[PDB]
């Protein structure tokens, strides 16, 4: 099931914390703001 | 055209979560900016 997720969406439901989603997604702004990708940075990490 | 539609100065305060337009708009003119550098130094070996 969690393959099923991870295949269809992009995401695994349940992983991460909500703390846990800032300190490592903080380097990616910068590519977020140079590349043109809009919305928070949660939708570019799962893009990539 | 929202400002062009109404000009009280106070409808700043309350349109629709202007200030992160503003930032990414001043953003991404720095951005191009940057990208500009290389066509300013063609025109500095144009003219003295």
């Given at each position: 099931e969690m393959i099923n997720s991870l295949l269809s969406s992009g995401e695994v439901p349940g992983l991460y914390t909500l703390e846990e989603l800032e300190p490592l997604l903080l380097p990616l702004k910068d590519q977020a703001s140079q590349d043109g990708f809009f919305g928070?940075?949660?939708?570019?990490?799962?893009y990539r | 055209t929202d400002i062009k539609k109404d000009n009280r100065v106070t409808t700043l305060t309350?349109?629709?979560?202007?200030?992160?337009?503003?930032?990414?708009?001043?953003?991404?003119?720095?951005?191009?900016?940057?990208?500009?550098?290389?066509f300013l130094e063609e025109k500095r070996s144009a003219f003295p």
């Open positions: 928070p940075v949660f939708n570019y990490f799962t | 309350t349109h629709a979560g202007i200030r992160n337009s503003l930032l990414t708009i001043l953003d991404q003119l720095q951005r191009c900016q940057r990208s500009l550098n290389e």
